[PDB]
Amino acid sequence: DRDPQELVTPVKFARLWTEIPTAITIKDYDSNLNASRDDKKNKFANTMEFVE
Amino acid sequence: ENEDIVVMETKLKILEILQFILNVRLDYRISYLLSVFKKEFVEVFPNMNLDRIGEQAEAMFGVGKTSSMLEVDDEGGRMFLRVLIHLTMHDYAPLVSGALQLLFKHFSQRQEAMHTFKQVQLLISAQDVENYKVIKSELDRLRTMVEKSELWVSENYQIVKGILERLNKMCGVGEQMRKKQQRLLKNMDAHKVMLDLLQIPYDKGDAKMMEILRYTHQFLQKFCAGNPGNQALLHKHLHLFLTPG
């Protein structure tokens, strides 16, 4: 619980026509935010693994 | 208070997590809906087969195996349902409240999905997305201030007047942008928030907050220009304006 970490909204109600893909998969759904998730998880990756 | 309060809270947090996960699943379903809609639009418009879209929507609700990974249990929801039933019988009050809430939500996936899909707003321009975000922030700030107005009804006057002035200035541009922004504000129920600003109990003579009402009314005049729908929606509240002035 520090400044770099911030709450997230699970559901997004604002969408952009061009950004919407023709087809969507779970892997792509993760991949869109995977860059941010990975670059923020490195600090707590070990705690992530321990918790799991 | 409970002797096992630690475990009570453990499963309370576990249900918290599961509800968050259900929200993310709903987001994924909405994205799937929008993606299939865009595919249909592009293929049809480089008629549209509503039957195929309906079939896909029906399939994605766990009816077919194509949506198994969405389901959060390996038993087809039996384990989740049994967990909720067991929790509802627990002594703790908020734990039972949460268990009941998830139980009710799990049997209302389709209606919730359609409601959220209707709530979805589509913008083709990224600049329009930024406009929506700034309007949302301004509306949220004004709504929060109106909800707790006893403080200012000094520091809560300048910000309010600036927000109102910015909204009024951005409200009207040309004719197409005017209609687009009118519809946008209609979706976010901004008119309700700005109407709540008119019911604040105020002294007869202030000379400072009056300018605020000098602007709040103005926006409502621009919110109805060439928009019979806005006129109709604000007509349901017509009794508010039946005051000398």
Place this chain on the structure above:
Amino acid sequence: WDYKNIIEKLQDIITALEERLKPLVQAELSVLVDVLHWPELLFLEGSEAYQRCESGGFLSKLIQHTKDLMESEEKLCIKVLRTLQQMLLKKTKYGDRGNQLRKMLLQNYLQNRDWSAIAATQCRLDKEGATKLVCDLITSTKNEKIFQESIGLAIHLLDGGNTEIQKSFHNLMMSDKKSERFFKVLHDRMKRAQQETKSTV
């Protein structure tokens, strides 16, 4: 691309999807009602939780929590009241697709396998305190919607002129020390209604 065309197509797909899945929503709600009807079937027969569900402990806990949560979670109280109303209501058909979805969901979850039935359900709910729940909310509700839902649930409880439910209602009225207020509440509405009538006439 055209923004107006995109918006119109989005509206059309929204309407089509909403229309298509209505019977599915009704079937899912009916599945919820059925699950509440037989919670034990989900649990293992040998498990003590199954015995508790069979004895009606789950429904008793649900009713007690409904009474407790009315002060804070009014929406949840309304939802549970409507759920009991549906429980007392007779089975209804929601179309071939809705019926098929109902069967599939019941099989997936409930894997284990008439005015008289209405009276039996009413007596079971009375044993669980549904009549007490509606009376307590009505005498202790400040929300109009909660009062309406409780009155509807009580109406369904007395639907068909069940003697046992009427006797329980009367006994609660005599025993309850807040019964006066109950009457007052109803009486108050009556008076208001009369005035409202005189206002519109």
